[PDB]
């Protein structure tokens, strides 16, 4: 078995929230443990960032 | 059934202030993000403003830059649109037009406009 | 940064294919995906082209959307033209966030 847990990543300014017709939990969803991380709004330089665990 | 209302449309002079808004319905509002877009008359398209899903991010168009501040209220579904410090060639109809993935990659073309709201600076 | 160039007017007999052209002058056409909008006199404007080629749900199959990146430019064609038709069309790209709208094109159907 698996034992998952948090690794309590949290972003600010980006979007963190991507769907996709393929993952479909009654709509648009995405993979449960995964985050999509998208630019704020569409074609948005997305800005550089350093995330450790 | 989805709309867009522009309202706040009318005659001024210059050097003064106004204010445009949009009432939102038929779609998620909180989810796009949403922009301001003229035309002057016998003129093209000029895209004017945009604000993003959770007001995070707002871009001005550089022609417009200073003046005109733009802002949502996710609570009432509305935008607002603030021109003040108006000048003789800002004349045109204004457009709000929903435009934004939304989240979704997929995402089939959602791209609404509204009927437009005139807006004459004569002197 | 960039401006999308498209010819003032363009005009085709009706039945007749016509193709408008929309040329960036900075940056590779490729780099940001390009909108074809029609505005129709007094009417708001409606989408016919999204992300170069997409046809969305309505528009006919006359309407097409394509790319020369060697002319660096994008293309809007109609085959078989009605005098429907007959209205202003404006090509849209990206710079970085901001929206960028072409000069507008005046196509006319002959009557």
């Known amino acids: 078995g698996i034992d998952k847990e948090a690794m309590g990543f949290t972003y600010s300014g980006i979007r963190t929230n991507g769907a996709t017709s393929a993952c479909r939990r009654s709509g648009s969803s995405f993979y449960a443990e995964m985050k999509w991380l998208l630019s704020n709004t569409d074609n948005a330089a997305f800005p550089q960032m350093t995330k450790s665990y | 059934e989805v709309q867009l209302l522009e309202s706040g449309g009318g005659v001024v002079q210059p050097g003064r202030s106004l204010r445009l808004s949009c009432a939102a319905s038929?779609?998620?509002?909180?989810?796009?993000?949403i922009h301001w877009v003229r035309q002057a008359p016998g003129k093209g398209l000029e895209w004017v403003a945009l604000?993003?899903?959770?007001?995070?991010?707002?871009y001005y168009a550089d022609s417009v830059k200073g003046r005109f501040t733009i802002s949502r209220d996710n609570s009432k579904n509305t935008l607002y649109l603030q021109m003040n410090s108006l000048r003789a060639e800002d004349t045109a109809v204004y457009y709000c037009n929903g435009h934004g993935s939304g989240g979704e990659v997929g995402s089939n073309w959602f791209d609404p406009w509204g009927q437009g709201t005139l807006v004459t600076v004569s002197s | 940064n960039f401006m999308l160039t498209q010819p003032h007017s363009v005009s085709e007999s009706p039945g007749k294919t016509v193709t408008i052209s929309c040329t960036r002058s900075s940056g590779s056409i490729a780099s940001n995906y390009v909108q074809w909008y029609q505005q129709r006199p007094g009417s708001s404007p409606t989408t016919v082209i999204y992300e170069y080629n997409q046809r969305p749900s309505g528009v006919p199959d006359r309407f097409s959307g394509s790319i020369d990146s060697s002319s660096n430019s994008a293309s809007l064609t109609i085959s078989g033209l009605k005098t429907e038709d007959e209205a202003d069309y404006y090509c849209?790209?990206?710079?970085?966030?901001?929206?960028?709208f072409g000069g507008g094109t005046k196509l006319t159907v002959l009557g």
């Open positions: 849209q790209s990206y710079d970085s966030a901001n929206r960028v």
């Open positions: 604000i993003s899903y959770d007001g995070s991010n707002k």
């Open positions: 038929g779609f998620t509002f909180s989810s796009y993000a």
